[PDB]
């Protein structure tokens, strides 16, 4: 505890995400809509838009 | 800081390992090179003000 | 992981140093988030840790 600033201990947790290769097993609080086909519609399909 | 010392450091192998154990600071603030890359290159004169 | 807070910076993408060359090597192409905070409180101990 009498170590300076830049001796003192720092806990580190990195987060490495994967890409949608695989199926987007881990996805945030985004409730899903229904699918509307044969139209011009905005679309997010897990996170392409 | 009016009367700021100036050492010029010459002729020796320079290792720039050893600052983070001799000085408790967080990071470097380097302009022209980078820190990591400071341990190959050589240069011809380096002065420490302070 | 626990780290000293002078080697808090080689934890990035195209890094060198001890801990990044020795212990532990982030990927040139990291998608990733660090999250590092001071845990001067728990980690350190009276007379050395
Ligand atoms: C600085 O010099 C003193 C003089 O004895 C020494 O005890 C100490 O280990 C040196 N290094 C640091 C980082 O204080």
């Given at each position: 505890?009498?170590?300076?600033?830049?001796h003192?201990?720092?806990?580190?947790?990195?987060?490495?995400?994967?890409?949608?290769?695989?199926?987007?097993?881990?996805?945030?609080?985004?409730?899903?809509?229904?699918?509307?086909?044969?139209?011009?519609?905005?679309?997010?399909?897990?996170?392409?838009? | 800081?009016?009367?700021?010392?100036?050492?010029?450091?010459?002729?020796?192998?320079?290792?720039?390992?050893?600052?983070?154990?001799?000085?408790?600071?967080?990071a470097?603030?380097?302009?022209?090179?980078?820190?990591?890359?400071?341990?190959?290159?050589?240069?011809?004169?380096?002065?420490?003000?302070? | 992981?626990?780290?000293?807070?002078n080697?808090?910076?080689?934890?990035?993408?195209?890094?060198?140093?001890?801990?990044?060359?020795?212990?532990?090597?982030?990927?040139?192409?990291?998608?990733?988030?660090?999250?590092?905070?001071?845990?001067?409180?728990?980690?350190?101990?009276?007379?050395?840790?």
């Amino acid at each position: 505890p009498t170590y300076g600033v830049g001796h003192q201990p720092y806990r580190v947790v990195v987060l490495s995400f994967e890409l949608l290769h695989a199926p987007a097993t881990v996805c945030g609080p985004k409730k899903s809509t229904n699918l509307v086909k044969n139209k011009c519609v905005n679309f997010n399909f897990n996170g392409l838009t | 800081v009016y009367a700021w010392n100036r050492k010029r450091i010459s002729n020796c192998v320079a290792d720039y390992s050893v600052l983070y154990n001799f000085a408790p600071f967080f990071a470097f603030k380097c302009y022209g090179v980078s820190p990591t890359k400071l341990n190959d290159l050589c240069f011809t004169n380096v002065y420490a003000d302070s | 992981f626990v780290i000293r807070g002078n080697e808090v910076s080689q934890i990035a993408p195209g890094q060198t140093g001890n801990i990044a060359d020795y212990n532990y090597k982030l990927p040139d192409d990291f998608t990733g988030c660090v999250i590092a905070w001071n845990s001067n409180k728990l980690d350190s101990k009276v007379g050395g840790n």
